[PDB]
Amino acid sequence: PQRPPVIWIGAQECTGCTESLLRATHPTVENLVLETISLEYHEVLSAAFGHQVEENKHNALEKYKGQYVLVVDGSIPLKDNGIYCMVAGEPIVDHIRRAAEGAAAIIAIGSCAAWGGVAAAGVNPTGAVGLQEVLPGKTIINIPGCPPNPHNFLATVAHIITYGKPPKLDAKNRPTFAYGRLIHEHCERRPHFDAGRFAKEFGDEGHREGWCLYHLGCKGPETYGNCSTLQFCDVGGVWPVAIGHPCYGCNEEGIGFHKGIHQLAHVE
Amino acid sequence: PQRPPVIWIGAQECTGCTESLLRATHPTVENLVLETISLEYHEVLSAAFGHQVEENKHNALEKYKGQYVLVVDGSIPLKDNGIYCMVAGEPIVDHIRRAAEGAAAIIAIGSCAAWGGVAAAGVNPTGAVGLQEVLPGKTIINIPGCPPNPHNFLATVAHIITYGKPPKLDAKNRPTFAYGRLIHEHCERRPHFDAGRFAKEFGDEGHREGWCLYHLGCKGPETYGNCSTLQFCDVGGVWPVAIGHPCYGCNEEGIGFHKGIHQLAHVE
Amino acid sequence: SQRITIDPVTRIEGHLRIDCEIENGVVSKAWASGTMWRGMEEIVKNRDPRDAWMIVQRICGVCTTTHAISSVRAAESALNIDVPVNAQYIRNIILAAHTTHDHIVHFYQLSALDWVDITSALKADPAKASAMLNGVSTWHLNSAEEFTKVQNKIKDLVASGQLGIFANGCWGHPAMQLPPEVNLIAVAHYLQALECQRDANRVVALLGGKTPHIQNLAVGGVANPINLDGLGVLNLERLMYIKSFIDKLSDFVEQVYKVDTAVIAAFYPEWLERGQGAVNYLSAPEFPTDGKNGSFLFPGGYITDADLSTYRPITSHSDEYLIKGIQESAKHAWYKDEAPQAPWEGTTVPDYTGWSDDGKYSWVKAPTFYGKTVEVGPLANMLCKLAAKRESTHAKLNEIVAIYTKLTGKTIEVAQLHSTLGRIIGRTVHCCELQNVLQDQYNALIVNIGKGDHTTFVKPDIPATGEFKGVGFLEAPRGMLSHWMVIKDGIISNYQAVVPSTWNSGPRNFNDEVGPYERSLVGTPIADPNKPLEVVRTIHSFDPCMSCAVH
């Protein structure tokens, strides 16, 4: 059988979202590219470089027109006519809008593409914005996180492939299976919260008893995600709060990279 | 280099506790038996049978007198002078009392050996009792559950080997690292419990949103264990309530095998 | 007439005692004895019918899942419940994946060291061992370098003088016939099997909530909440995880386990010529795929007089012919009531009198089917499938025989399947065919969810008054299992389990006919009555489980 085509474009990315694929187990990255999809364009992995790699994109854009899913990784810098991210001599926005026109679906992977992320934080030096702002006439599937659990992305494209449509989305176009609930509304330390059992400093008695981390600045109460349940890396018991550190709100616009680590959830 | 000796005795067991070792990953069984300990006696796995294997037991008992950890798996039937469990023509209670005399440490693995478990429930046809009742005046480490996560046992043994003493125990002699807290006081559905979001029947709306299982009979409120955190099988996200079914209380005496699945727990 | 006792028989589940009379170097008569009893049937009595499965699952943790599913099937039968098809898909996947772990562990961990000498493996040339597999298997872990690493682990084990559970095995026994090289091959495969069986149990865990002892069932269906778009429930992401482990099983089963089965046979051809347990065989059909508890993927039935032409198919778990024939007798077991009992009217009143060759000598009841003693298990289910002309089973058996032929120049007739090795071959065939039920049922579950069906549960209506009888059949790793529930006024008034190792390990019945284990031992040659490897070999072929047999 012919495998569904995927075109991946990195803008202002740290490559964390690609790297997440390397931790995946269902599918593993090798099974992904050899069995479940055809990764037609991805600069981190591609044998071809320079002129040959751009040949590959234009070839895939035409051959698989109307059929590929377009994945954008990273924020898009709008300041100074797009010059803060230039590949093959053109602004990344240009590459992205051209690809978007032939796309069967469009996924913004990571908080940066989803809503600007870290690169759009603070004074936002480059005028970085999220994918939806760049592609306003198109519906964009947002899969935020810095980076998300890779399966939030993989199961989303699997749904499209297996069932011929995107998974159910919330108001911010995030798949409900991964982002439908606040981390706090499904967190295993909530009883400690209820009881007022709080860690005050790392290494204190409470902390060493696995108590709630609200007062270390946990942002679980205002961050939508599946970090407490799906967690990370498929080994069991691995997410930031479980290893001893508060949620930073990396999934969530206005929270991650805006609020201080130790700033409380109820403090703006 | 010499590996610490372990003698494993099965009384009224279902072999689930031995089987739990086959799911283990740190260490895997083969690493356990080749590298970590020397398993001096275990009927399910021993190459030798009958007279040969009883000789093996006798040899190890005197050779490693004062050094082996004794693991007992299963309840011990005291009714009718011990005849409901006979190996090599003798009551298992006798084998157990003999092996306990030269033990460096004694471990009751599984709820049966820890407090009587399933075999002692209802009318208790065989007068089955736990290891502590059979061995008064001996310190017994209880690792309850039916079966427990094998690492509840493995990390207990490893603590003994590495640090020369048992791990910290609670009032019922259960290791605090695995049994120190109610499941309900560290459960990820607690926010749903707090809010009044309950599954009322398998397959209903709440159930299919992963809401709290209290009203389906979850015994989380009255059982100590690490099922919600360590969970099972090291693949991530796998314990009974995560897959959609109430805790039954299999760890806790007077709970599992006594209360109905759908009977409600007392909440502290 | 020399008398030997083997107690305990190791590398089985639970507590088995085997006695033999030996005359002229050959066992002439045998006794099988289950030496531990718990009274599990009495323990579940007087509870809500919904509670039984969680309790009665604890009959055994080797064949975990098995009593659990048979228990809910029995309650469902009593209450006339049609199981939601999604719930069948889920039960099927769990059963098949569990059984793949079960069979692999039985062949390697429980059985291999009957036929394999580890001290001989020390003498092997790894390069020679690897080379003799060329064109025999495509397995990627048969290199000389793999075999050397395995060999060094054994060398190191030996060097420590702590052989542990490998100590004092039957190394050097005259009945050990493998060359040093294939001994090493088998040890390497023994170790590889542990990885495969763990993957099988990862599939079980993701649906069951853990294993040993799943916790995802209910009378009425399963407790898995199907919702592709739900957080914390059975969504596409979890389904993909389950599939990922299903895909890892087949290669080992096809390229190692299937191949080792024919190799063992090639070096032990007379074991195709002894070990016959019975002339009658029963299996239940298994893996229902409709919304009415039927449409099984695997057929079952009844064969008599070792004659496949007598095959009577059984295609329904409600077959009255099947239901009405089953009885158990305690004439030679330590129970009070001795006449044959239909399980719905069964009793289990302990009556220990100690050992008597002519009287009572086991805690195992002796089942019959319309008075006949029958062997159950993978040989029985293979024979039924063959007689049903199931092409898949013939094709799979023939694959094994072809390997045997390539190695020996000989073939294997259906007549030689009535033996210690045929029984082992039936189990390997079963394991191979289950890989396709895993693929099939996963895909069916995926497509059904796609059609919009997320139903997993039907709520049982248990009337507060009246009497209801139900029987749950299941074709377990070790054979046809059945749970028999009587409900009176909303509670369990009677509960009886008739378990496959009950059929096989049962003592002499009401007319003094020996059970399959006992029959299979007659004619077993004995080179050394102090080290009766040959009886342990035949007994293991039945995959004994004594917590199952006795409960």
Add this chain to the structure above:
Amino acid sequence: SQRITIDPVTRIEGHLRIDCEIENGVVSKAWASGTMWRGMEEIVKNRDPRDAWMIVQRICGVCTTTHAISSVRAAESALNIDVPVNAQYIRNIILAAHTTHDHIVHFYQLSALDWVDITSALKADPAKASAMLNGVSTWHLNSAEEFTKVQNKIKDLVASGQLGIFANGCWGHPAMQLPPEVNLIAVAHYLQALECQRDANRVVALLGGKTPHIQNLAVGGVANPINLDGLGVLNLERLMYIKSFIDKLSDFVEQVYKVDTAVIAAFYPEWLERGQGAVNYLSAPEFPTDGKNGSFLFPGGYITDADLSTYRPITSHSDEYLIKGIQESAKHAWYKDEAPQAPWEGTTVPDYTGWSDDGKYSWVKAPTFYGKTVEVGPLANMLCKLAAKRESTHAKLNEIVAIYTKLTGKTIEVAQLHSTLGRIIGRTVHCCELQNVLQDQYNALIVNIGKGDHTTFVKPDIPATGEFKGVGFLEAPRGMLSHWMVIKDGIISNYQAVVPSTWNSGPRNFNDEVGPYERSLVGTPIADPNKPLEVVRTIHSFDPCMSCAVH
């Protein structure tokens, strides 16, 4: 005369453009351009010093962990914090396990397809390929059967007509010199590598809380709670789990990765004679093992004139000699202030001017050490360790050389290490030695916890007024990393990162000396100017990361 542009350079992290002038089929002059900028330095400005590490970790996700640890080390420097030794053990285990994953992925996933032709692998004889490795490696996954499975997967991929990431690569290019069999070998190892790197990251995950982007650090130590007897925290069970994955790393590293480095060298001997990037080398010492931020397992230092005898050891991250030498210049980069700046006084104000051969042409600053340009990374760290007469490094290098000599009968002198293959060799040696770092620190951690020390965090005292300067060094996978933080009145007034790929990919500096990528390319032969594989080969040897270089 002839000018080519490679844009994008592929199989690296981030956005890199490389221009070359070609004379007589040989590149005569080169330009390296980082073409994407985010301004991560300005983004962290004006925040609590404790916030920095979570934010600047996002400079890069390929070399995750690195910017995080350097950032806390800089704040700790500013505040004179002695890091609890337990936090050191944990930081070290994370760094070493991450770097294992990182190097593996660089050799195979990022670099191998420069040297390996997949279409030639299809033509290979699997048995011949497997036989070639007899006596060369003891790896258990080099069987002809393994290689057949791999070949079939490539075969199926090409057959489908969707080559994906393998489409339109340099297949059949004249610089491809491996025979079919070695191509197949490398592809098999490429696939096997993916498992090993996953195992390395599971170590990282269990301590960091996830990867990419760990979340267990603090200014003052780590957020892991050590308590052997506690539920939900870092107990003995979690520690055993970590160890289980640590133990799974060394075999692939020693028996596969280390071996392949030599066989690539065997078929590409000239690549020991081109690609030299510099005559000066810098590395920081790494893996502190005491409670005063010192006692490093790995030594650092500075070498000039490609002469190991000039080696000036650096054994403290507080060494003023190291701190005083470092400056950066944007004379030829897209920033306003052009004169060399010390990082504490560093500025980063964008001045994009477009491309100019003689002017500005990159977002990467050009760093210098006492005015000199210097190569950083595994070649640098290996040379320093060799100059330090570190026995482990010489022995590990010698193991690689011996395999090469076994294959070629030739040898490799330290002079030949100043090259594209020498740089690759340095990376392999680093990965190899790091496996002993993992074991050492795991054990040190276990023994320290058993002494009763469970301290992991010292709270920082951050004065609400006053100025404080700190620098955090870290020997990253791609070379010496430094984060420079100025605190003024409780908040960050300046923040500058000088990243290893900044050193290597830097444009012409204030004295117009070219950067290491730029120098390395001069003299590279080009068989086809439209497909400059040879350039890509030398550039990849530096393991470029442009998010890192530019931030």
